[PDB]
């Protein structure tokens, strides 16, 4: 048995996140520095209004993906790490999951840094003392301890941050536009003086930013409110009410702040609003500076933990269930995370990570197909928590599922500017024949699937 109280399905009575609450989780989660960089550098190839469109479109495809990747986590309360055991082996799943726990772990050390940068700036703007590594650890530590309260903290931190973050941001837009003496409509077309990038590849950059989060949204949405006694059609609207809720959460947030990064590039040549606003206004008081850094800190705290630390935690305590618990996996994830010192390799590896990211397309494709198409939403929680059962396949690993991944990754390369969507579509389509083959050797269903509700 692989079950322990932390990696256990989340019982109907334990659920705490409704449709309104999830948007407030996503809105603040979308407000973060790394879109500034992304949306800023985009002004090199397109003008601001198209980037906003590349953002809304890229935001929506992520949501179209969420409607599907979230449906199993909401209904059955299960892990990401646990759920992968289905198509890949119980152990074979550890391969893509290790790729993914790694991305996630990377992103955690990047934002701890940006956060650290903020706190260190707040302090050195009060004392000239300027030690970052100490502020790194201390920040890593602070998140973990607030992460100990799992989704309970996250949901509360984000409902109060959201309007504040929304307000600090709308304010920011006023300050830029005013101090430069420019209307909104004027800034909306100032970019794109170096065309070359396909607009599809533009859209693919905003999707693929949240590719880690969306492919493993599970770790968030297993906490969502569900009515166990719905139907096919009430379950679909439930899924849809949530997918819509995630849309209303990540779109208006990342559009306002995407625009700020782009505006920054376009007004002063820097994606970083700290620089661009400082200039345009010609310096600012130490208070109003510290604020901005508080923004960065508030903007980092509402995104890093929930998106980057939750999922390796659950990966640890659920693969080594007697070795790790949720709280200890969190400590081990933030430590592994920081000891990768990713803030000195983000510059370099940029193009490399975009590859690893869009190579999760088959993972999402194989997972959507396994649960929805092959098995028809009919799963056995019982077997997911046991070393030997219908999800063990060949001695813990489903090599045929690992084959579809490779194959789909290859085919993915035939369309570099649409890589992600072809490999998913390829894996999705290939899992079907691959699984109708494996079903001749191993069973796709189990008797024990009637104990499902016991877990809930
Ligand atoms: O899963 C994740 N955890 C994270 O910290 C990042 C956040 C992120 C980074 C870059 C982006 C670039 C373009 C659009 C969205 C982006 C989002 N992703
Ligand atoms: Na945030």
UniProtKB/Swiss-Prot annotation:
Keywords: Membrane, Metal-binding, Sodium, Transmembrane, Transmembrane helix, Transport. Changing residue 107 to F: Reduces moderately the uptake efficiency. Changing residue 210 to A/F: Little effect on uptake efficiency. It is a multi-pass membrane protein. Optimum pH is 6.6. The chain crosses the membrane at residues 20-40, 48-68, 94-114, 134-154, 157-177, 197-217, 248-268, 289-311, 329-349, 352-372, 395-414, 418-435. Changing residue 111 to N: Partial decrease in efficiency of both binding and uptake. Coiled coil: none annotated. Its main location: membrane. Substrate binds at residues 111, 209, 308. It is found in: Membrane. Inhibited by dinitrophenol, 5-(2-naphthylmethyl)-D-hydantoin (D-NMH), 5-(2-naphthylmethyl)-L-hydantoin (L-NMH), 5-bromovinylhydantoin (BVH) and 5-indolylmethyl-L-hydantoin (L-IMH). The affinity of benzyl-hydantoin is increased over 10-fold in the presence of 15 mM of sodium. Changing residue 107 to A: Reduces dramatically the uptake efficiency. Na(+) binds at residues 28, 31, 299, 302-303. GO terms for molecular function: metal ion binding; nucleobase transmembrane transporter activity. It comes from the Bacteria. Pfam families: Transp_cyt_pur (PF02133). One of its GO terms (cellular component) is plasma membrane. Belongs to the purine-cytosine permease (2.A.39) family. Nucleobase-proton symporter that mediates the sodium-dependent binding and uptake of 5-aryl-substituted hydantoin compounds. 5-indolyl methyl hydantoin and 5-benzyl hydantoin are the preferred substrates, with selectivity for a hydrophobic substituent in position 5 of hydantoin and for the L isomer over the D isomer. This is Hydantoin permease.
